[PDB]
Design a protein around this ligand. Structure first.
Ligand SMILES: CCCCCCCCCO[C@@H]1O[C@H](CO)[C@@H](O)[C@H](O)[C@H]1O
Ligand SMILES: CCCCCCCCCO[C@@H]1O[C@H](CO)[C@@H](O)[C@H](O)[C@H]1O
Ligand SMILES: CCCCCCCCCO[C@@H]1O[C@H](CO)[C@@H](O)[C@H](O)[C@H]1O
Ligand SMILES: CCCCCCCCCO[C@@H]1O[C@H](CO)[C@@H](O)[C@H](O)[C@H]1O
Ligand SMILES: CCCCCCCCCO[C@@H]1O[C@H](CO)[C@@H](O)[C@H](O)[C@H]1O
Ligand SMILES: CCCCCCCCCO[C@@H]1O[C@H](CO)[C@@H](O)[C@H](O)[C@H]1O
Ligand SMILES: CCCCCCCCCO[C@@H]1O[C@H](CO)[C@@H](O)[C@H](O)[C@H]1O
Ligand SMILES: CCCCCCCCCO[C@@H]1O[C@H](CO)[C@@H](O)[C@H](O)[C@H]1O
Lengths: 233, 233, 233, 233
């Protein structure tokens, strides 16, 4: 039904907003102030967007997040691909629109995710993994219909999880936690240096999060039947 | 019924508070610290006011927000006009009372919304549009009775949306997102320079937000019948 | 019943905690950083305490707040007096315990509420009034059983209202919004300079808040009968 | 049942995350900025983890917290021991993994809890006690099934309680409030100087919190029967 294309649209616009506001708030340099401010910006961007379209598409706005739900057998392979496609175009569009209204000199590299001189790509990949792992874990747990009438706003919980990822990570890798968010700055600045970290960390972390939740913490046992039936629809 | 004049009163007082506390917290200059602090101040002012009178008038406290609900066919043309009237007088009053208790030298221009030297009014109008668009989108989605028992506090969600608007926007336009909030400082400092941006951006953004929500994301299909019946009451 | 002395105890301990953590976090000087940090500290202290004992005593932890509920005919004159008595002793105790574990030199004046050189006591009284007014207004609205299943945490709403009061007020009067919180530092430092502001502003603001809510925004019509019956119990 | 080993696993992973992100965000020095940022980091780490596994193990992720529930007769002596065991190994593991991905020079002492030169260990023990006391009090009150449909997110309430503990405490003792969180940095840096404070304060505070809640504020009267029956299972 049209109850599918609306979601794809939700994922496109939300991703454009997420990157537009996220990157926009990161322009400049610096420091606690800097980190604190950028951590809150991405976090509140997500909390806002999750309230805005979480009921419509589940507000993934993140390829690694969508990948998590795929292996978690909660969405079809067809939906996953489109979500990720919409997320990549949306992100690029947000970065594009951001570039068009931002004064040069302040533009910098459009907040491209970058490693710290003293951090190896191996350590950086492990960082991005842990960041995305606690992040996806919070998403799965709070989206789980099987629990709590005392959750409060799941939109904010997830947003603050993203903020926590930044408060810690920015010092190491600028905190990617999202392939699409990393990709947009890279494709427009023509700089794919160390970009592998920002696809690998999140995907693996997202993978370990889903697995850890569904197959150990609070098992959601699906029969091989449904798995394929779902991965198909 | 009197269940109409109470709301108008709600919109008047809330607007006076919103501008009084919002502007008051913006006095001085500066920087992350500055932005972070002012972003939180406006955001918590709104979250507070939405809890205070959201059940009474819907706590619009914003002309662009009210305009959104008009074209969204959720209020009558009569209510909209009064809301906006109460919001403009309330704002001016808040700025007035703020001026009366604030020491000169610190008064400055009473936190008048201003463009960044390197930002064209065109880019500034597009910024204000995006700010108000994600803002109204969050308002519509969270006010929508058709969803979530996991929303948490809608008052805070909207407040944090406003904070996010500031964390990004202040650098560009000081972040207006609200004609009344922009108007009060302008009418009292007799400075309407670039004021057009602060009416145009929000109204258009607010317009694109409502449209995007009601006519694409989660359609609330009203028959031409009701539309006019509502725009009339 | 004992369902009365537990509350008095709740108000005593909560007040000791509120002042202990509130004042403790205010030691030193300074600035956004300073204000932001102290605003959040008092705010989260209250949100925490409101969750801790709001179900037991309503977590007033504030004389002006209790006064609001008295004139609001929601508590007896006997309860009000004891609450305020417990709040004053609790506060002093918190400031006392704070003094005993804090290094001198850092102690300063134990975060005594103070006016800004350029702010007259008249302007300062009006500031404290507005601060306490939006504060009590948020308390009444969120405590009102007659509304919302979308409130979220009322504990946090009220806490953030207090934070907003500080983000704006600290620059003017250090933000009292609470006679007991102002009193404790004064009685122990033997400095009652301008102390009148910190009793007068809140009480009046608290008074205008209750009146504004119960007699205009969302009238809670009590017959003269009940009023006295309540003010008596 | 396996509905026991999953919890132990929950407590292990959550503790590893808590310390990994908590300590990681504390690396460097400094100041409001520093404190504010670290306070929020620990706070959001907990809020995140409480949402992630609070429904599975109750998300204690803290020996003093678990001890509180033991004397509160809410868990068996067998569960308590394992929880604390999982929490200690998890913490050490988190600090270990943190060390492996962090650049030296920035590593410092891995955010080891430390006293302020002007604070005696006696004053420091009293500080840690008060910090953990308001903390456990908030945990008990918000976990109490006997109350509120207006709590909002208990995960966030507890997290913000931890943040408040840091906003005040870091200046005194770096804010331990958690034996496991203090232990991990100590065992790996081979520095147990003043470590006694970080086990004694929390345990006592946690003890006074439970007692204060269950035996005075909102008594949860258990017959000697059940107490032992519970402490046994
Ligand atoms: C879910 C997977 C979790 C993996 C946790 C691994 C912890 C050990 C990390 O060792 C680090 O490996 C880097 C190369 O990758 C080296 O450059 C670095 O010096 C070394 O300290
Ligand atoms: C599970 C599928 C994961 C796919 C991840 C794709 C990451 C994009 C690759 O970036 C690579 O970075 C290297 C430096 O590190 C560059 O030398 C190389 O030219 C560039 O292509
Ligand atoms: C919902 C409407 C969204 C519109 C998005 C428009 C993106 C392109 C913006 O282009 C900008 O236009 C400015 C004038 O307006 C020029 O001064 C500036 O140099 C140019 O880069
Ligand atoms: C949908 C209706 C929108 C109405 C918007 C009204 C905005 C107020 C106009 O401000 C204008 O700003 C110009 C500079 O930019 C000044 O030269 C001009 O004198 C001043 O009047
Ligand atoms: C609910 C009550 C609201 C009252 C609002 C009053 C607004 C006008 C404030 O005027 C101020 O009065 C001070 C003395 O009090 C003077 O020192 C100051 O120069 C003057 O500007
Ligand atoms: C509704 C009842 C309100 C009661 C308020 C009592 C406030 C305490 C008085 O402080 C006063 O401050 C003056 C300077 O301003 C000092 O000169 C004076 O000696 C001191 O006593
Ligand atoms: C739940 C228990 C609460 C206990 C509260 C105690 C408050 C009094 C603290 O006195 C302090 O004791 C320190 C040694 O411990 C001395 O070094 C310090 O100079 C002294 O001021
Ligand atoms: C309720 C049980 C509480 C157990 C608390 C154990 C705390 C660990 C002890 O740290 C101690 O710190 C001293 C300096 O202060 C060192 O001299 C001593 O060598 C070291 O062992």
């Amino acid at each position: 039904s049209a109850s599918f294309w609306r979601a794809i649209c939700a994922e496109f616009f939300a991703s454009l907003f997420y990157v537009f506001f996220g990157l926009g708030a990161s322009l400049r340099w610096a420091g606690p102030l800097h980190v604190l401010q950028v951590a809150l910006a991405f976090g509140l961007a997500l909390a806002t967007l999750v309230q805005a379209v979480g009921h419509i598409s589940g507000a993934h706005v993140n390829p690694a997040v969508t990948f998590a739900f795929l292996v978690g057998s909660q969405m079809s392979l067809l939906r996953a691909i489109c979500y990720m496609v919409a997320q990549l175009l949306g992100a690029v569009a947000g970065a594009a629109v951001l570039y068009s209204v931002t004064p040069p000199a302040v533009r910098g590299n459009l907040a491209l995710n970058t490693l710290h001189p003293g951090v190896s790509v191996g350590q950086a990949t492990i960082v991005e993994i842990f960041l995305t792992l606690q992040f996806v874990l919070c998403i799965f747990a709070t989206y789980d219909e099987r629990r709590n009438g005392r959750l409060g706003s799941v939109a904010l919980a997830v947003g603050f999880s993203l903020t926590l990822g930044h408060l810690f990570g920015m010092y190491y890798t600028g905190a990617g936690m999202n392939p699409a968010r990393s990709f947009a700055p890279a494709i427009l600045t023509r700089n794919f240096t160390n970009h592998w970290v920002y696809w690998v960390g999140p995907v693996i972390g997202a993978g370990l999060g889903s697995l850890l939740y569904d197959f150990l913490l609070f098992p959601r046992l699906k029969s091989v039947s449904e798995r394929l039936s779902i991965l198909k629809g």
